[PDB]
Design an enzyme around this catalytic site. Sequence first.
Site, PDB file in Angstrom:
ATOM      1  N   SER A  43      12.591 -91.687 -21.355  1.00  0.00           N
ATOM      2  CA  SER A  43      13.205 -92.982 -21.670  1.00  0.00           C
ATOM      3  C   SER A  43      13.263 -93.907 -20.464  1.00  0.00           C
ATOM      4  O   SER A  43      13.538 -95.096 -20.627  1.00  0.00           O
ATOM      5  CB  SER A  43      14.626 -92.868 -22.192  1.00  0.00           C
ATOM      6  OG  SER A  43      15.420 -92.034 -21.386  1.00  0.00           O
TER       7      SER A  43
ATOM      8  N   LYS B 269      24.782 -95.674 -23.496  1.00  0.00           N
ATOM      9  CA  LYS B 269      24.032 -96.474 -22.565  1.00  0.00           C
ATOM     10  C   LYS B 269      24.643 -97.853 -22.512  1.00  0.00           C
ATOM     11  O   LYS B 269      24.810 -98.418 -21.429  1.00  0.00           O
ATOM     12  CB  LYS B 269      22.577 -96.534 -22.970  1.00  0.00           C
ATOM     13  CG  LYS B 269      21.844 -95.257 -22.795  1.00  0.00           C
ATOM     14  CD  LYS B 269      20.357 -95.533 -22.883  1.00  0.00           C
ATOM     15  CE  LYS B 269      19.558 -94.330 -23.271  1.00  0.00           C
ATOM     16  NZ  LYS B 269      18.196 -94.742 -23.609  1.00  0.00           N
TER      17      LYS B 269
END
Lengths: 145, 291, 97, 243, 49, 49, 49
Positions: free
Chosen positions: B198, B241
């Site tokens: 990611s 996140k």
Amino acid sequence: SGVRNLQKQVEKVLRKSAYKIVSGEAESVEVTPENLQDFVGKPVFTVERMYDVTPPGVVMGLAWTAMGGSTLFVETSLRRPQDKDAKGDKDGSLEVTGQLGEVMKESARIAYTFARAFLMQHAPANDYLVTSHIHLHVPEGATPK
Amino acid sequence: VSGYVAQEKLAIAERYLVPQARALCGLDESKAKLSSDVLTLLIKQYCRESGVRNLQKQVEKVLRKSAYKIVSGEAESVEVTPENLQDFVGKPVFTVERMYDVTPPGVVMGLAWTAMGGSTLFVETSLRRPQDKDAKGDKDGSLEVTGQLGEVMKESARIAYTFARAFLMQHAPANDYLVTSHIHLHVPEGATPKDGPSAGCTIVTALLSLAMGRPVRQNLAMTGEVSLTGKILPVGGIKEKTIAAKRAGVTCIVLPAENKKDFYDLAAFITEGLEVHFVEHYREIFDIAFP
Amino acid sequence: GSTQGKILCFYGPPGVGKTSIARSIARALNREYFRFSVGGMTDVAEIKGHRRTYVGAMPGKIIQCLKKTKTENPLILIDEVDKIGRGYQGDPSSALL
Amino acid sequence: DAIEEKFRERLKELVVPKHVMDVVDEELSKLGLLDNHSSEFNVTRNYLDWLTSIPWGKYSNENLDLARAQAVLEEDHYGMEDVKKRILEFIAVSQLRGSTQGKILCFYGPPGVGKTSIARSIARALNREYFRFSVGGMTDVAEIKGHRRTYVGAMPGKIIQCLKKTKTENPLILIDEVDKIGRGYQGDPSSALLELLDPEQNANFLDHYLDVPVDLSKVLFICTANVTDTIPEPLRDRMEMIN
Amino acid sequence: DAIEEKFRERLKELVVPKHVMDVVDEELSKLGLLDNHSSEFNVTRNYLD
Amino acid sequence: DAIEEKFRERLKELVVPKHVMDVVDEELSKLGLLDNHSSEFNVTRNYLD
Amino acid sequence: DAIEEKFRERLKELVVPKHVMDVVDEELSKLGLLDNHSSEFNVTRNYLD
Ligand SMILES: Nc1ncnc2c1ncn2[C@@H]1O[C@H](COP(=O)(O)OP(=O)(O)O)[C@@H](O)[C@H]1O
Ligand SMILES: Nc1ncnc2c1ncn2[C@@H]1O[C@H](COP(=O)(O)OP(=O)(O)O)[C@@H](O)[C@H]1O
């Protein structure tokens, strides 16, 4: 390929239906596709088959992975400017990658040499393979055998 | 269960935490008031962790010092004030969240869904040899990844590298910085392996920043997953996140379009003050960062 | 109809409030509560006691919970499953299944 | 019942928790079941030694005036007013909010700064009993929690011995060199220490050798590590890191 | 009879399974056959409890 | 002999091999020598069960 | 007592350092508690030797 994950989903949907019954509003839940995104949330997968136009030098390949089978792609690309010297005569060394096992390394070199032979046998004026370096990537997943 | 927003910790700690520790030191509110202002300063500065455990240590310390001020000390009723506070809990340690501010070229922010919470780890790169080793030189500008790589992170890195090399000739052919020079690149450890790839969407923007040498636009955190042909892919764990990006003062953010769903599940107060830019093909991001 | 068992899992960053909700449920349903940490454990005997012919044998921790909590249907709270000792010495995690 | 009677007049003096009283009662019932000459009788009679030896309610009283702490720290340690003021605030706050209170603490700096020396100086300041316990590089769990007591050669963890030696229920334990504790797959003692250091779960600590819960709540633990960064986060986050 | 009967009235309240019923009862029978002094009987006594 | 007798009617229904028959017979006698309370008697009791 | 006492007689001859005086004293007290059959007894007897 297995049914285990769908078994989890339908479980989830039912128990949420139970919550709507025992105290909730409806006396008879009726799942419908428009209704569905409520109960089980937003879609997870959509973009089946990553590439669609397949820009040059990428090809599909089936693989009998450890569980089920999956359509992993294979990819390649240049690693240096090719015409480093118009007269240069150095082998266009390959660089294999993707957690390769050594047996695959021998297979890779065999396939490479066959490519080099097929080109000069077919269209001699082209020389892309013998005169340039190339990175090649095979995604992991196939069982060794 | 998820983490907690900076403001959210205030409403927690004023009710469910402060009285409990007050029962641990055995005092009553009559003698040891703690205003909201002390709490907001605490959580904003002295404790940047998704859990509430760290603030729980601080408020413990403050209370127990108050107990010492009562039973033997001078005041019969300690009254903490922010000006008072530095006595009790000492001087501030952290303040300057997000170390770089001018972000000199070739460093970019990147979110990471670490094993606990989420953290805004930076990614950095730099030259490792003289660039003009030969004006005619034709040697691949070999990369050197570093920062506790797992091998899977290594293939992701090489993929992103090749896409950078292609994007330059697609954009500005005259430049040749990437293919003709060595480069060290450093990804700080912390990301769990499954999300490892990611970080990759950050990587390519790092390299490009180094290429033209222009700085990235300030405080534009990003994340994604690159496809070797400019398609971007879904990432996981978005709620952690986004809160980690909130703590660091980020004021823009970029996500794969495939996660336009999950991000909207979040409570509306959590999402205020951000300005998201969903994107799918990579070229999009290039126009929302540099120019 | 009757009360039913079910398994559930919580997961997230440490210190999010997990154990506290556990107990809040325990006084919600009115079942008796009992924490049972297993972080770093390797003692399969803890899940099953000992033979009682072994020297010093006593039944596993759970039985102590039944003797203490006095209900047939308490709310056991296994803790920190992630760090269960999965070794060659007899994996308790196999024993927990 | 000779050993049983000497330990029982003991039992009459030190105020054992009633739970541990009844647990030693059933265990003593088994000791009556156990033979006079058996080698297991020796292991369980020396178990009775380790268990009865432990103070159960002996409570060293502290001084609580800051002044006597002023002197006694000045009697044996010059200067360093920061650490003294810290300990002074420590006593000043515990003295305010009624009863004694726990907290863990660490000192760190170059070796030989007097760390252990101030430890003992505080131990004779508060009047708590002293006991060093190095844990630098330790790995086995038999020295911290003990053995099962069914293993050949089994012995209780170090703590049971410190209680056996110091004779108070509320000493000043001094674990040493926490930073380099062996954190391995073989049963990590450093993880095992959390049961010691948990503010609530220390009160009902139990170990495999002697099953009976102990009540450490009055102990004033202290721990010493040369550098604060290497210590794992769950242990490091609780305690204050004085320098 | 003392311990056995306080545990027996215990047993009379809680509805034990017939399997566990015969187990506790036959263990009680073995208590009766086992002599009180034996450490084996102390183990089965502790077990009954 | 009570335990051995429930055992022996047991065995009277199911047809054992003569091998294990003689083995249980000598173990049954070996049990019968053993004390009614010895720890090893409990071991061989559970074993014969 | 034989091993402890030959350590003792040599102690009468050789003057161990007072720290070694103490250490050998507590280990000597430890020697009598242990079984001759115990595994740690071998390593600690050889250690005191
Ligand atoms: N929403 C909440 N309400 C009340 N307390 C909370 C909340 N979230 C966190 N806490 C606090 O977090 C602390 C630890 O929470 P818990 O999950 O019970 O253990 P841990 O978080 O350490 O696993 C508790 O002391 C609790 O008061
Ligand atoms: N301020 C001080 N007062 C008295 N002794 C001190 C001081 N500073 C250092 N020392 C000495 O330093 C030595 C170190 O001992 P100690 O703290 O006991 O263990 P460590 O070596 O782990 O620090 C002692 O001999 C002690 O006398």
